[PDB]
A paper describes a structure:
Like the TET proteins, [name] is also a Fe2+ and α-KG dependent dioxygenase. Here we report the crystal structures of [name] [name] (NcT7H) in apo form, in α-KG-bound form and in complexes with α-KG and T, 5hmU or 5fU. Similar to other α-KG dependent dioxygenases, NcT7H adopts a variation of double-stranded β-helix (DSBH) fold as the core. The active site of NcT7H is located at the front end (opposite to the back end) of the DSBH core and partially covered by the α10 helix at the C-terminus.
Crystallization of a C-terminal truncated NcT7H (residues 1–299, NcT7HΔC) alone yielded the apo-form crystals. The Crystal structure of the apo NcT7HΔC was solved by the SAD method at 2.3 Å resolution. The asymmetric unit contains one NcT7HΔC molecule, which is well defined except four surface exposed regions (residues 95–116, residues 198–207, residues 278–282, and residues 296–299). There is a metal ion bound at the active site, which is provisionally interpreted as calcium as the ICP-AES (inductively coupled plasma atomic emission spectroscopy) analysis revealed that calcium is the most abundant metal in the protein solution and the structure refinement yielded a reasonable B-factor. Since no divalent metal ion was added in the purification and the crystallization solution, the bound Ca2+ is presumably co-purified with the enzyme. In the apo NcT7HΔC structure, the Ca2+ is coordinated by three strictly conserved residues His214, Asp216 and His271, which constitute the characteristic HXD/E…H motif of α-KG dependent dioxygenases, and three water molecules in an octahedral geometry. The binding and coordination geometry of the Ca2+ and Ni2+ may resemble these of the Fe2+ to some extent. Indeed, our crystallization experiments show that co-crystallization of NcT7HΔC with α-KG and the substrates yielded only the α-KG-bound form (data not shown). In addition, our biochemical data show that NcT7HΔC could not catalyse the oxidation reaction of T, 5hmU or 5fU. The structural and biochemical data together indicate that the C-terminal region of NcT7H is essential for the substrate binding and catalysis.
Numbering used by the authors: -1 to 94, 117 to 197, 208 to 277, 283 to 295
Write the structure that this text describes.
Amino acid sequence: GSMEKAAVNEDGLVIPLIDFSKFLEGDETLKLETAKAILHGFQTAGFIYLKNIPIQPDFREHVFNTSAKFFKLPKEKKLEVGWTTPEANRGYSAPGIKESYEIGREDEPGHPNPWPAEQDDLVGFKSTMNNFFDQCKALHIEVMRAIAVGMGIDANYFDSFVDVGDNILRLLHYPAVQVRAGEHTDYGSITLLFQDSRGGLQVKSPNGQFIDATPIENTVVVNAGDLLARWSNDTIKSTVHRVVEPPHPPRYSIAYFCNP
Ligand SMILES: [Ca+2]
C-alpha cells in the first residue's frame, strides 16, 4: 500500500489507487515503494486503479469523442470494416444491445486493421487510434515493469513479451438503451479499462459478492488476467468480474487487452 485512499473498500475487497508518476519519475526508494504497492494490489484484489498516467486527460477525452463519431456512422459504413477472423480480432462487431470496434498492431502479417473511410469529421480517426494504441502499449510495458520491480527481479524482464505489441484496443458503445453469466476472468497479462462516468464494472469480493468498481475521473482500471497468474504460479490473482447496467443515457468505454 501507499499514501492514497483506496478506490474501492467494501466487503473485504480493497482496490488501491496509485499515483503512477511516482513509479515513472520518483527516486529509487519512491519507485520501489510504488512498485510494491502495485504488486500488492495484484496479489490481493487482482485489480488496481492508476492515476497520473502519461496518457493525458485531454487526449483521453479526444479519443472518446473520436470513438463517438465512429459509432455514429451509418450501419453499412461500420459493417464495411467488419470483424473477420478470430485470429485477426480486428474490426467492427454489431449487436449480436451494444457494438464494438477492435484495433490491433499495424504490422502483423496477414492481419491488417480494417480502417474506415475518412470524410468530414472522421478525418484523423486512424492517426488518433494508432497514437492511443501506442500510448496504451507503452503503459502496458511500464505496468509489467512495476510488477517486476515490485517482485525484486530485473525491471526489463517482461519487455520481450510485451514488445511484440500483441494487444487489442477495443472501443465499446452502449446505445440508449443487470447481467448474470457475464462473470469471467480475463485471459491475458493485464487489461486497461477507461470507463465513462456511469460505470458498470463489478469485481467479486473474497467473501463472494460483486462490488461496484466506482468510476473515478482521470483514472485507469488495471487488472491481471490468467496468463499473469500463470506466469506468477498463482501468486497474482486473476479475479472474477463482470459488467452490468448501472442504476439510461448512452455509454462509452475503452479497453486495452494485453496478450489476449
Ligand atoms: Ca474482463
